[PDB]
Symmetry: D2
Subunit: 386 residues, 4 copies
Amino acid sequence: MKIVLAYSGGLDTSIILKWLKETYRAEVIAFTADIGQGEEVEEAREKALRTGASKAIALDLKEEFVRDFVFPMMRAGAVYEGYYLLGTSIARPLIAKHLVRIAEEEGAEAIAHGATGKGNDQVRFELTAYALKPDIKVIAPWREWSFQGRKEMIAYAEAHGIPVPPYSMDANLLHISYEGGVLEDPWAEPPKGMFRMTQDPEEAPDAPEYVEVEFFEGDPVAVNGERLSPAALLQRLNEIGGRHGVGRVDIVENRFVGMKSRGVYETPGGTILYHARRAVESLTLDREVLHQRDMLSPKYAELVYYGFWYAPEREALQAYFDHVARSVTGVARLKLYKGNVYVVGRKAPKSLYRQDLVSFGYDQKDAEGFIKIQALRLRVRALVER
Amino acid sequence: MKIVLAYSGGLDTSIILKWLKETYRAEVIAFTADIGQGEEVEEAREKALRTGASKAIALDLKEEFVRDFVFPMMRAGAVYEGYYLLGTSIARPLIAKHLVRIAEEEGAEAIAHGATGKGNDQVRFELTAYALKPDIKVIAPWREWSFQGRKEMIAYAEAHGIPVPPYSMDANLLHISYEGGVLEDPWAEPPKGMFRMTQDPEEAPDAPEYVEVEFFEGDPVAVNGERLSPAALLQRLNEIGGRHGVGRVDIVENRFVGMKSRGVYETPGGTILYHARRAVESLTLDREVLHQRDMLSPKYAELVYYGFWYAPEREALQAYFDHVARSVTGVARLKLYKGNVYVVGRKAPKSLYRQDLVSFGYDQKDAEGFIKIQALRLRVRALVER
Amino acid sequence: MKIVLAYSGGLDTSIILKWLKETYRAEVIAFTADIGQGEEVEEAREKALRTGASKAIALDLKEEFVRDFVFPMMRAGAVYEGYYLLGTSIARPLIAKHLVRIAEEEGAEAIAHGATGKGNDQVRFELTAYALKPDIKVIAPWREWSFQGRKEMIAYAEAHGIPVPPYSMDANLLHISYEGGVLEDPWAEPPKGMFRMTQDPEEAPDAPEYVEVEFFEGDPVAVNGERLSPAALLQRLNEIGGRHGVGRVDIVENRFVGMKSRGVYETPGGTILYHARRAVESLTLDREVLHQRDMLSPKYAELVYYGFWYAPEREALQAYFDHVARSVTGVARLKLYKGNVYVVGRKAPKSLYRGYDQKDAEGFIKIQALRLRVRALVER
Amino acid sequence: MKIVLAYSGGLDTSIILKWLKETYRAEVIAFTADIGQGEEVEEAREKALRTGASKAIALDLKEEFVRDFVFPMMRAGAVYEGYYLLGTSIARPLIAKHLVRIAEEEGAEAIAHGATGKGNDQVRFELTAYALKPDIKVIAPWREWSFQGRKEMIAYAEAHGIPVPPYSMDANLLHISYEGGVLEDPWAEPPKGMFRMTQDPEEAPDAPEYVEVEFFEGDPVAVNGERLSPAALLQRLNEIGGRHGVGRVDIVENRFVGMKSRGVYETPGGTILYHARRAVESLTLDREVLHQRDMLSPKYAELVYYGFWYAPEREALQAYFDHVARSVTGVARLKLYKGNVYVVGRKAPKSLYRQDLVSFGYDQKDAEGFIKIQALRLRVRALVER
Ligand SMILES: Nc1ncnc2c1ncn2[C@@H]1O[C@H](COP(=O)(O)OP(=O)(O)NP(=O)(O)O)[C@@H](O)[C@H]1O
Ligand SMILES: Nc1ncnc2c1ncn2[C@@H]1O[C@H](COP(=O)(O)OP(=O)(O)NP(=O)(O)O)[C@@H](O)[C@H]1O
Ligand SMILES: Nc1ncnc2c1ncn2[C@@H]1O[C@H](COP(=O)(O)OP(=O)(O)NP(=O)(O)O)[C@@H](O)[C@H]1O
Ligand SMILES: Nc1ncnc2c1ncn2[C@@H]1O[C@H](COP(=O)(O)OP(=O)(O)NP(=O)(O)O)[C@@H](O)[C@H]1O
Ligand SMILES: NC(=[NH2+])NCCC[C@H](N)C(=O)O
Ligand SMILES: NC(=[NH2+])NCCC[C@H](N)C(=O)O
Ligand SMILES: NC(=[NH2+])NCCC[C@H](N)C(=O)O
Ligand SMILES: NC(=[NH2+])NCCC[C@H](N)C(=O)O
Ligand SMILES: N[C@@H](CC(=O)O)C(=O)O
Ligand SMILES: N[C@@H](CC(=O)O)C(=O)O
Ligand SMILES: N[C@@H](CC(=O)O)C(=O)O
Ligand SMILES: N[C@@H](CC(=O)O)C(=O)O
Ligand SMILES: [Mg+2]
Ligand SMILES: [Mg+2]
Ligand SMILES: [Mg+2]
Ligand SMILES: [Mg+2]
């Protein structure tokens, strides 16, 4: 039986690559995707044919990632439990998508990933796979093998002949994530030097830096006047924001599978994009529309976090968020300074702001009528209390 | 006829005190509330008598303000349109509450305030006024008089001999807000040296400062180990946070009255409390409870912003928020550095976090069944789409 | 000066037509819409000319009504305060839309309506008017004149030769509504014989009647196998449902302008459609999509009731509802009997009705239980 | 080893009792609850002993069922997917609560139930058990045994001296439900004569019957002037409403385990109470409160349906609903006629209704200002759209 493996190029997926050959004695098609992890994905591809893959595939998926996943999510203003911008959550559906596609092209019966049985990724990968190909066979080695510890895994590796080697990490164009190890103690500050994508606030420039982001119908299309494709734009903003230490979050989140987990996230580009978007929305979105959208964002966020991307509830909400987002067109101007992102200006060709309505269609005495009617039910209530 | 005027002590409220006497020929009882504006109310009170008041009352309400208004609102995690912590919003109900109390004591048929017809404050004062005493009469000189300009107003002061003197501002224990004037241009960054409560970040200490906040049953009770009363506690956090330039936001908000307005706000202590509270909630609140609470927070916020404090909807939601907040007991550790507030640690007597659930509560197969069940409907969906 | 008046042809708008000519010394263009009130609109158009209108317009708007207002609203499962199917609510935006359009074509600076200052219709008419044409001028005589009672109004009409003929009523293709007068005491049952569109349940047929309604992509397209246009379909279900006394509701509602009001509504066709729609949705909609939808429906309902039809919020929610409703394709089979509507069958081309093993269930449960056990252990 | 078995008395639980003894080499303590299923619980209690239980407990939990489970739920206006009044759903938590209680008193380490692995009841039984006693062991035979059919199960029963006997049913004081078998075809109308608790409308009296229900503080306390205890009251309304064939529903619902299923429910008393409650709320509840409440009701309904009764989300929402419900005091008058329940009147001591404001607290002029303010943002949008 052929099996398509989400191959990362590291120890575990290498061990998994042989484990699959050994255990199932199946033909293994490896798949590595470049989503901005900062790894020469082609090496991964080499190491896979080298580990025994009957075929290895690598694809530059950066643009599709930002265009078809990050952007639609940002359009919805998705924030999980107040701070998490879903860096890892949104990338998983993209990977599983290709896994299933490849499996259908290779006539492969199953797909495999090395997400552990303790996290959210296994759900994201599998819900995606089952949603796209209900008959797909899934193999999650971490839930099926006997290994107990890394000593045993290192051992097993040293065996078969797989090169071997404080916290776990997941990185992509949207963010870099840290959790586990020394991070597992909620009262322990993260260790100095851990952050990779963002410069340390204290080592951030002494002079603030201004940046402008242009949005067109809900999506960012240019930075400082330079049009940039989805991936190139997130990249650019990561560079600009990174140098200033922007986008660091430290939270104890609730995992879908039931337990709390301490995670640390750095999302420089995305964090600038989040505040810039709300800046443009502040002029282009109607009051009542904004208030409704915001009360739905959290639900959409958990859908993403839990793994329900290619799910009807999420696609339905997407219709609402996309409708609203289509009006978000304009430019936000932000000030970057030692870890902070400050909105200092915004403009829109179709801005709903009118200074003439605030400076000292509006008539003061109308306010009295407004107030009286609004107060009626309250006045009746009081009178009944007598 | 008697009129209880919410007298702040400045030009406008002085012009209004005179106006009320000439227009209604009634006794004008002035009431000035100390809520942290940084004015010596007792001075406004004597000036009120000088200006013509038949009786001037001054009351220290910082404790009532933080305890009975700011705290209940904070338990709800109230945040208007993404960034506004509602500093001015929760103060108005307190003031109105007293105007009506005094009127009832003085045998006054009416109360008066100097909020304009273009803003939200008029609604806040009046909805609480009518909600508390349905038969009360409200006079809002700004909606009734003829002054067409500032100059016309300065002249009227002189005619009656009242002391006379780029943006408007409101300051209390919770924050200091700025809007209007040069701020009316949303593309124009606020002027240097505008902020008053928070030191400017570029001028804040070079070394981060750590602060710890203890929450008992939903409310903050101590700072760095020192137990403090509500007002004293907010004060302490303003000092600490201000020194670091924390809690600065710049937004274009939607007023209840219909138009957008560019607002700038500095909420040092409140911003530290916002994040400290969530840090403690991250260990003490159940996942689902949290997700539901966050989708309701925005609604409660709009209620406070619009002026529906003493309204049955707000009081109802308050019952839910208080029920949830009751479990928020623990300590948050945050790092303050040049305008930013970072959560670096948190602990709680009844933390729901367990490292044993993440260290490498169920076994591997459990996750598989959970996944199969969760995917069932997605697979049926896909099969039907055949 | 020209004023486009929403003229229904009765005493009030006739008086209003006279009042406007003299008070504003303007030319009045009358507009009467046929939305299924069961009245000859042409008669109204003629009476308007006799009353003094410089021009009178009458349009058959039943198809536009059901297709562009009733259908989109139904796709949303809109129900105000648990019972009100919003019969009068969704109709007002339609009328005002035409008032503003006619004003545009006739070069009229203002429009007028005879909705009183204590109801919801004035808000509905004006919010839509202002929304579609921001600088339009609106005149609501009930808010501007000073008639001190009916007596004085009858007198005024008699003076102008306007013919002067226990509760207030409103009727259109969607429903017939009753409120005020003898109905103002919420403890009192409506009087017998008050109902018009529906047969009294005690007088309904002794045999039940089965009906089948087909929905295509969120909209009902046929009844008992016969394809029918929007308006014709609502009419057919009103006949079928009405004969059986279906769709009667008695509620005390909260008006947008602040007070409670006791209302009685008969919506035979819309009531059948409401249950028929959910019946088809029960096979075609996903569980989570359905649950989210139902939690948003009430907000939409209040938007319609309040008069925010041509408002961005309602338009945004409509995008969600329409997206969801597009899957509603199938047939609902209902049984009608003396006042009641019983779903009795349903089917669909893409039904989601009918894999794992009992074992998977244990895992699902263990994982779902985890946070609950932790909470318990902590409580010690 | 001791095992507390939720013993109903039928073939399945008798088989399970014997199965448990030999499979787990343990003694079984049988528990039969009287929740208005219309059976003699003492006979089941005695049959359990004959089947081999070491001890058999039988309790009349009717009053607790209505007072502590049904009323709280109704207070929330809980309705699942438009029509299900949750008759079976709210009874399960009550059963499991006692199983865990009895296990602790008897020193039993585990509990057992005969709910199948493909239904919702397993989730309801187990989630409440684990929530109340985290270390309890749960044994669900349907998910563990090797019986391969009904034929084998009958032979096993007959071999163990257990007496052996178109759709499946569940009956209790709140309703009677039917599903499976012939009912599995969603296009087929239920068979004639299926209903039990309610008379067919065709056979219901030609004379309508008026019934009045008094609500005190969110709960029904009297019927036609006669004070009745919770269980006695539900019983009375089932009798009155049942004669008129009120409360029948036919739906295809979404199960928590992932699939859809056709269910038929008859809830005479509950249906009368549902409309009676709303009738009383129409006079006693504030507009904004009601609207917020109805938007949360569905969520609470799914919690109950899924089995999250003794769960923090549910108890938090219960705080909101109970707050709101406290104001629900008055009497509702309904007319029952051939399958229907018609509200014809309502009155309340603290009714918020005043015909003082409808017949011909403000004047039409206030209405004008109200409209203008409300329309401002819509007008701005139109001008901007040009
Ligand atoms: N770039 C990729 N291409 C293909 N599959 C991937 C890729 N990245 C991750 N995966 C899949 O995800 C599983 C977990 O990946 P991994 O990079 O180990 O994340 P992690 O568990 O969050 N952190 P770490 O502790 O560093 O392993 C792997 O076993 C892969 O199957
Ligand atoms: N400390 C106070 N004690 C009593 N009444 C107050 C107090 N502060 C504000 N008010 C009331 O609020 C109205 C508006 O107050 P004001 O201080 O002018 O706020 P502002 O409109 O936000 N900004 P500005 O006037 O431009 O400084 C006043 O007329 C008072 O009636
Ligand atoms: N069919 C129609 N065509 C044009 N305008 C209409 C039409 N129906 C109603 N209107 C407008 O709506 C206002 C109120 O109409 P109306 O028929 O009096 O309803 P009502 O106030 O609910 N009940 P009633 O007690 O019968 O007056 C009228 O003054 C008209 O301006
Ligand atoms: N009154 C009760 N006392 C104790 N346990 C009960 C009681 N009622 C139900 N149970 C438990 O619930 C499981 C399922 O009960 P049951 O009455 O068979 O419901 P059902 O599955 O919906 N329908 P059916 O078996 O077709 O009549 C049983 O195996 C029992 O363990
Ligand atoms: N160190 C890591 N690899 N972290 C990955 C974090 C994933 C994040 N907790 C999520 O649920 O999406
Ligand atoms: N410049 C000022 N005085 N601003 C007061 C800001 C009040 C703030 N916009 C609010 O709605 O509460
Ligand atoms: N008797 C009448 N004319 N009733 C009109 C009812 C209108 C209904 N109350 C609404 O708000 O839409
Ligand atoms: N025929 C039966 N035994 N039905 C029990 C129905 C239970 C119902 N489906 C529920 O989810 O609560
Ligand atoms: N990637 C980690 C964490 C997660 O999936 O949430 C794991 O495999 O467990
Ligand atoms: N206090 C300001 C602003 C506001 O009330 O929103 C005014 O009186 O207009
Ligand atoms: N149509 C009625 C009722 C309403 O508008 O709600 C009126 O004009 O008053
Ligand atoms: N009681 C049935 C159905 C259900 O629980 O939903 C079963 O045991 O499967
Ligand atoms: Mg890993
Ligand atoms: Mg002012
Ligand atoms: Mg009328
Ligand atoms: Mg059974």
